């Protein structure tokens, strides 16, 4: 019974989730003036081309859009990664006002919401193996801040009315990912952790510079969308994001001056 709530969110975590304070945590603080350029890391190889999406879900915390990953469909690779990783899912982290909404943060800064794009090495064969292995994850991670509408995130804000409750899920076919990336591939990485439980110490970070922008009506049906069942007390899913974590023995590297 983890959530966002006061009883319940992340300063709660740590008793049935110890890993919350351990060593390489997320999200965290990215001090831009310590981030160190690494002209070795190579450009992220993004191919969204043949993405199957499949299904949109509330799970009660977020909602997932899910994705087929039997195959190499779409897949990310380059940057700071060794090997080939498949888009599983994505989802967002979103806040109850402009001003906060997503996990990490940059020089403080803390944007409406951040999306994170889930892949797993598939070296282990499937997720559930992936999330065991320090290397197992690499999550692609995007801020969002208000201004100009985003035509790409249009159809996800449209079927949110039929997922309105937890444990709902709506069929969602044909929709493609790209159209949710900024220009620019530049990056910072480190390796940290899943940012809900069970917190696992699993993840390559790569969180783009660039923002993309959606707009006010946009982020308003997010915060429509409800923690709770159908028929249960209507909690409004707002504020779901961990706050900064400690960076601890860990160097944040950045693809560009
Ligand atoms: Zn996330």
């Given at each position: 019974?983890?959530?966002?709530?006061?009883?319940?969110?992340?300063?709660?975590?740590?008793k049935?989730?110890?890993?919350?304070?351990?060593?390489r945590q997320?999200?965290?603080?990215?001090?831009?003036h310590?981030?160190?350029?690494?002209?070795?890391?190579?450009?992220?190889?993004?191919?969204?081309?043949?993405?199957?999406?499949?299904?949109?879900?509330?799970?009660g915390?977020?909602?997932?859009?899910?994705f087929?990953?039997?195959?190499?469909?779409?897949?990310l690779?380059?940057?700071?990664?060794?090997?080939?990783?498949?888009?599983?899912?994505?989802?967002?982290?979103?806040?109850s006002?402009?001003g906060?909404?997503?996990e990490?943060?940059?020089?403080?800064?803390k944007?409406?919401?951040?999306?994170?794009?889930?892949?797993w090495?598939?070296?282990?064969?499937?997720?559930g193996k992936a999330?065991?292995?320090p290397?197992?994850?690499?999550?692609?991670?995007?801020?969002?801040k208000?201004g100009?509408?985003?035509?790409?995130?249009q159809?996800?804000?449209?079927?949110?009315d039929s997922?309105?409750?937890?444990?709902?899920?709506?069929?969602?076919?044909?929709?493609?990912?790209?159209?949710?990336?900024?220009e620019?591939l530049?990056?910072?990485?480190?390796?940290?952790?899943?940012?809900?439980?069970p917190?696992?110490?699993?993840?390559?970070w790569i969180?783009?510079?660039?923002?993309?922008?959606?707009?006010?009506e946009?982020?308003?049906?997010?915060?429509k969308?409800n923690?709770?069942?159908?028929?249960?007390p209507?909690?409004?899913?707002?504020?779901?994001?961990?706050?900064?974590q400690?960076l601890?023995?860990?160097?944040?590297?950045a693809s560009?001056?």
């Amino acid at each position: 019974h983890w959530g966002y709530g006061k009883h319940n969110g992340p300063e709660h975590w740590h008793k049935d989730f110890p890993i919350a304070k351990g060593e390489r945590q997320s999200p965290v603080d990215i001090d831009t003036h310590t981030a160190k350029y690494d002209p070795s890391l190579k450009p992220l190889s993004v191919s969204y081309d043949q993405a199957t999406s499949l299904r949109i879900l509330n799970n009660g915390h977020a909602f997932n859009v899910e994705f087929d990953d039997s195959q190499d469909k779409a897949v990310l690779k380059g940057g700071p990664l060794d090997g080939t990783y498949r888009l599983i899912q994505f989802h967002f982290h979103w806040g109850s006002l402009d001003g906060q909404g997503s996990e990490h943060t940059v020089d403080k800064k803390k944007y409406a919401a951040e999306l994170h794009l889930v892949h797993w090495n598939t070296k282990y064969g499937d997720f559930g193996k992936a999330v065991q292995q320090p290397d197992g994850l690499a999550v692609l991670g995007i801020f969002l801040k208000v201004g100009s509408a985003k035509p790409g995130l249009q159809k996800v804000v449209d079927v949110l009315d039929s997922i309105k409750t937890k444990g709902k899920s709506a069929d969602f076919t044909n929709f493609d990912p790209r159209g949710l990336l900024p220009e620019s591939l530049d990056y910072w990485t480190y390796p940290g952790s899943l940012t809900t439980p069970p917190l696992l110490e699993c993840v390559t970070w790569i969180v783009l510079k660039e923002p993309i922008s959606v707009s006010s009506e946009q982020v308003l049906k997010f915060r429509k969308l409800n923690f709770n069942g159908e028929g249960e007390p209507e909690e409004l899913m707002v504020d779901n994001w961990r706050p900064a974590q400690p960076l601890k023995n860990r160097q944040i590297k950045a693809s560009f001056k």
